[PDB]
Design an enzyme around this catalytic site. Structure first.
Site, PDB file in Angstrom:
ATOM      1  N   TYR A  27       0.883  -1.190  -0.009  1.00  0.00           N
ATOM      2  CA  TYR A  27      -0.058   0.047  -0.014  1.00  0.00           C
ATOM      3  C   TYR A  27       0.618   1.300  -0.099  1.00  0.00           C
ATOM      4  O   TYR A  27       0.248   2.340  -0.170  1.00  0.00           O
ATOM      5  CB  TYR A  27      -1.076   0.035   1.099  1.00  0.00           C
ATOM      6  CG  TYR A  27      -2.315  -1.065   0.864  1.00  0.00           C
ATOM      7  CD1 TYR A  27      -2.064  -2.256   1.280  1.00  0.00           C
ATOM      8  CD2 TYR A  27      -3.495  -0.706   0.350  1.00  0.00           C
ATOM      9  CE1 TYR A  27      -2.907  -3.293   1.300  1.00  0.00           C
ATOM     10  CE2 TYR A  27      -4.152  -1.582  -0.325  1.00  0.00           C
ATOM     11  CZ  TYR A  27      -4.045  -2.950   0.287  1.00  0.00           C
ATOM     12  OH  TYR A  27      -5.234  -3.809   0.079  1.00  0.00           O
ATOM     13  N   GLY A  29       3.102   3.961  -1.406  1.00  0.00           N
ATOM     14  CA  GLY A  29       3.417   4.494  -2.905  1.00  0.00           C
ATOM     15  C   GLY A  29       2.860   4.499  -3.891  1.00  0.00           C
ATOM     16  O   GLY A  29       3.047   5.069  -4.741  1.00  0.00           O
ATOM     17  N   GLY A  31      -0.128   1.696  -3.732  1.00  0.00           N
ATOM     18  CA  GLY A  31      -1.443   0.853  -3.425  1.00  0.00           C
ATOM     19  C   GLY A  31      -2.043   0.090  -4.345  1.00  0.00           C
ATOM     20  O   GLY A  31      -1.347  -0.503  -5.259  1.00  0.00           O
ATOM     21  N   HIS A  47      -3.842   5.345   5.217  1.00  0.00           N
ATOM     22  CA  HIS A  47      -3.482   6.868   4.585  1.00  0.00           C
ATOM     23  C   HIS A  47      -4.409   6.809   3.154  1.00  0.00           C
ATOM     24  O   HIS A  47      -4.977   7.800   2.797  1.00  0.00           O
ATOM     25  CB  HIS A  47      -2.170   6.886   4.258  1.00  0.00           C
ATOM     26  CG  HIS A  47      -1.800   8.240   3.723  1.00  0.00           C
ATOM     27  ND1 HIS A  47      -1.095   8.310   2.364  1.00  0.00           N
ATOM     28  CD2 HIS A  47      -1.852   9.587   4.373  1.00  0.00           C
ATOM     29  CE1 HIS A  47      -0.869   9.561   2.126  1.00  0.00           C
ATOM     30  NE2 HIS A  47      -1.253  10.433   3.182  1.00  0.00           N
ATOM     31  N   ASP A  48      -4.258   5.470   2.316  1.00  0.00           N
ATOM     32  CA  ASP A  48      -4.971   5.475   1.226  1.00  0.00           C
ATOM     33  C   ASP A  48      -6.392   5.620   1.453  1.00  0.00           C
ATOM     34  O   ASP A  48      -7.149   6.418   0.770  1.00  0.00           O
ATOM     35  CB  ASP A  48      -4.589   4.127   0.432  1.00  0.00           C
ATOM     36  CG  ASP A  48      -3.239   4.047  -0.132  1.00  0.00           C
ATOM     37  OD1 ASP A  48      -2.488   5.027  -0.035  1.00  0.00           O
ATOM     38  OD2 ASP A  48      -2.749   2.891  -0.165  1.00  0.00           O
ATOM     39  N   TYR A  51      -7.246   9.327   2.183  1.00  0.00           N
ATOM     40  CA  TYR A  51      -7.421  10.132   0.887  1.00  0.00           C
ATOM     41  C   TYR A  51      -8.781   9.766   0.303  1.00  0.00           C
ATOM     42  O   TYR A  51      -9.408  10.609  -0.552  1.00  0.00           O
ATOM     43  CB  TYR A  51      -6.218   9.570  -0.013  1.00  0.00           C
ATOM     44  CG  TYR A  51      -4.954  10.659   0.118  1.00  0.00           C
ATOM     45  CD1 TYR A  51      -4.961  11.499   1.102  1.00  0.00           C
ATOM     46  CD2 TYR A  51      -3.952  10.537  -0.599  1.00  0.00           C
ATOM     47  CE1 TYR A  51      -3.624  12.092   1.467  1.00  0.00           C
ATOM     48  CE2 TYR A  51      -2.565  11.053  -0.343  1.00  0.00           C
ATOM     49  CZ  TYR A  51      -2.454  12.154   0.696  1.00  0.00           C
ATOM     50  OH  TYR A  51      -1.328  12.720   1.018  1.00  0.00           O
ATOM     51  N   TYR A  64      -0.777  22.255   1.826  1.00  0.00           N
ATOM     52  CA  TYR A  64      -1.292  22.809   3.102  1.00  0.00           C
ATOM     53  C   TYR A  64      -0.244  23.216   3.848  1.00  0.00           C
ATOM     54  O   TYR A  64       0.889  22.971   3.599  1.00  0.00           O
ATOM     55  CB  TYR A  64      -2.123  21.481   3.989  1.00  0.00           C
ATOM     56  CG  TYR A  64      -1.219  20.592   3.892  1.00  0.00           C
ATOM     57  CD1 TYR A  64      -0.077  20.441   5.070  1.00  0.00           C
ATOM     58  CD2 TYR A  64      -1.311  19.115   3.092  1.00  0.00           C
ATOM     59  CE1 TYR A  64       0.747  19.164   5.158  1.00  0.00           C
ATOM     60  CE2 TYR A  64      -0.637  18.068   3.226  1.00  0.00           C
ATOM     61  CZ  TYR A  64       0.375  18.210   4.252  1.00  0.00           C
ATOM     62  OH  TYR A  64       1.182  17.039   4.481  1.00  0.00           O
ATOM     63  N   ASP A  89      -2.251  13.186   6.363  1.00  0.00           N
ATOM     64  CA  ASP A  89      -0.713  13.058   6.282  1.00  0.00           C
ATOM     65  C   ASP A  89      -0.171  13.093   7.376  1.00  0.00           C
ATOM     66  O   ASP A  89       0.737  12.101   7.619  1.00  0.00           O
ATOM     67  CB  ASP A  89      -0.158  14.322   5.303  1.00  0.00           C
ATOM     68  CG  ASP A  89      -0.373  14.082   3.921  1.00  0.00           C
ATOM     69  OD1 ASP A  89      -1.023  13.164   3.548  1.00  0.00           O
ATOM     70  OD2 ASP A  89      -0.069  15.126   3.073  1.00  0.00           O
TER      71      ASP A  89
END
Length: 121
Positions: A27, A29, A31, A47-48, A51, A64, A89
């Site tokens: 997953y 870099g 996924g 994290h995926d 998003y 951000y 993040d």
């Protein structure tokens, strides 16, 4: 953005996002599919998904702002998308730090065929 995330990763872990977290396990870099290989890979899975909670945001490019209060990452107020991207993040960077104790080089450049089956977010 992806570059800011990379900098947050380096700050948190002392590892370079590329190559340490850009092709790690199933997953990190890139996924897709499979059972995450270890805790670090699960950070990337989450994290995926994080998003994926934001289908009308653009986490690769949208920048951000964040600051440090002592150690702690504090996302500063931008657009709604930027705030949510930053929280995704921040969580992944913290997750990577919390799991450095297991991080395994054998999972760098992990081959895709060893990653099969859908795991739901």
């Amino acid at each position: 953005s992806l570059l800011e995330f990379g900098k947050m990763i380096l700050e948190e872990t002392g590892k370079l996002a590329i190559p340490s977290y850009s092709s790690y396990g199933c997953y990190c870099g890139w996924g897709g599919k499979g059972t995450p290989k270890d805790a670090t890979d699960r950070c990337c899975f989450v994290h995926d998904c994080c998003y994926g909670n934001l289908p009308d945001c653009n986490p690769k490019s949208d920048r951000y702002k964040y600051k440090r209060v002592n150690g702690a990452i504090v996302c500063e107020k931008g657009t709604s998308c930027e705030n949510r991207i930053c929280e995704c993040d921040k969580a992944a960077a913290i997750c990577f730090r919390q799991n450095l104790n297991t991080y395994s080089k054998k999972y760098m450049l992990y081959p895709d065929f060893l990653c099969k089956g859908e795991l739901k977010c």
